[PDB]
Amino acid sequence: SETRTLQKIREATQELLKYGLLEEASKPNLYRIVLSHPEEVTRILEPLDLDIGIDEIRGLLYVKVRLDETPAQDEWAHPLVRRQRLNLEQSLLVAILRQHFVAWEQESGTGASQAQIAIDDLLPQLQIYLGDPGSESKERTRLLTLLDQLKGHGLVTSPDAHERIVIRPIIAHLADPINLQALLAWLREQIAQQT
Amino acid sequence: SETRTLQKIREATQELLKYGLLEEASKPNLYRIVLSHPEEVTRILEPLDLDIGIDEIRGLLYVKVRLDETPAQDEWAHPLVRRQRLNLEQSLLVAILRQHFVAWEQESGTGASQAQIAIDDLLPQLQIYLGDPGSESKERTRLLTLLDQLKGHGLVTSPDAHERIVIRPIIAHLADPINLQALLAWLREQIAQQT
Amino acid sequence: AFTLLNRAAGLKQLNSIDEIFRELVLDDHSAFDRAAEVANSFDGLTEIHQ
Amino acid sequence: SQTVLQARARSERDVRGFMKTGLAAEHHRVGHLLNEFLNLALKLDWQRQMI
Q1: E strands within B126-178?
Q2: Alpha helix stretches (DSSP H) within chain C
Q3: Which residues of chain A have a CB within 8 Å of the CB of B39?
Q4: Which residues lie below 8 Å from residue A130, measured CB to CB, with a gap of 6+?
Q5: Is D19 within 8 Å of C37 when comparing Cβ atoms?
Q6: D20–C41 CB contact, under 8 Å
Q7: Which residues of D fall within a CB distance of 8 Å from C44?
Q8: How many distinct helices (H) and strands (E) make up chain A?
């Protein structure tokens, strides 16, 4: 019947759907191919109510619901996407990494260099804001579980030889950072009131 | 201004992608919408290397992997598919379910999905192949785990109040003669290797 | 024992000596379901014969 | 003795399941196919989880 879409476009679109993003520093072929065929990609995604947000400064592509704002409800619901709500600890970790990424972009500029941090610099703040689980080993296990969970969402890389991790630039496009700031303020108030 | 696909078609295709299948008996409106523009749905799914099969007789639409240039090793390697490959205990349960399905269809014709079987009827059948651990509760737990796994693939509804399940007509297409005769040859080969 | 205890609290009537045993005291091992099973086996065989 | 009678009833129910099949055209083919596959099945090593 009709002709076929270019195999590269199909492959890149399926990748972007599987991982919800593409990175210039990781998969340059798909990234540049999608950017050079942007109209085609938005045409493919249009009928699913999907669209691509783009970032040349940070070299990040990502999907974004194309539903018109408040179309039928105050806050939308999309069949093919599930709006998960992170548990408390996960919210703290995203808040911490968001703030550190913002500081990194202050010191280095936006999208100029990847954000990095050491596990030993995160563990003290997790202890500060959540309490001691019983040992350094349990703290590290909890942090590893959380970091794996975020890696599932494409928010963090795996630990490397320096016990360091890289913060995925996708955080710059998070939904409600102000709610994260509010939660952080609530936490710094609770850490004081509780003791 | 911009060409936006009919809202109904967009909603129907999004839901159909969500559920992997779409039955007349449960969502007739979207099913008919798709049947009214099947080439639109094919045009929509073609780029992702997904296609649309159809069975108007039973009233079932199921998305199936496009065959044009997918890896011949298996279509389950497709990036978008989320569910794991079927395993052969699940395949045994599928075979028994298909046998019951055809037994019922003989009496009821190709009518709506009244294919229902008591959970108790399965235990004797599975007991032959999977042994007798001598504890009806243990084998019930085993069978219910298998049925949960199959409901993951959409072949059966979860047990209702009366410990009964309904076999989704999709099974007829996952266990149609060509698939059965491919599996049969592969299993004969496996037994030959066992010897 | 506790099953009898419950039916003791609710015994407002105290109808007759028979009812005491038939309802509260002697637990129920009635064989209605077993008879249904026997009937369903006999029909099962009559199906083969037909 | 009721257990003897219950096993007997189980066998009778299974033969009832088997007997009534006055199949039709479309069914008959897949019925033979499934029977062949099931006969293949019995010779596997089910107690081994890997299988």
Answers
A1: 164-166
A2: 2-9, 17-19, 32-49
A3: 1
A4: A89, A92
A5: no
A6: no
A7: 9, 12-13, 16
A8: 7, 5
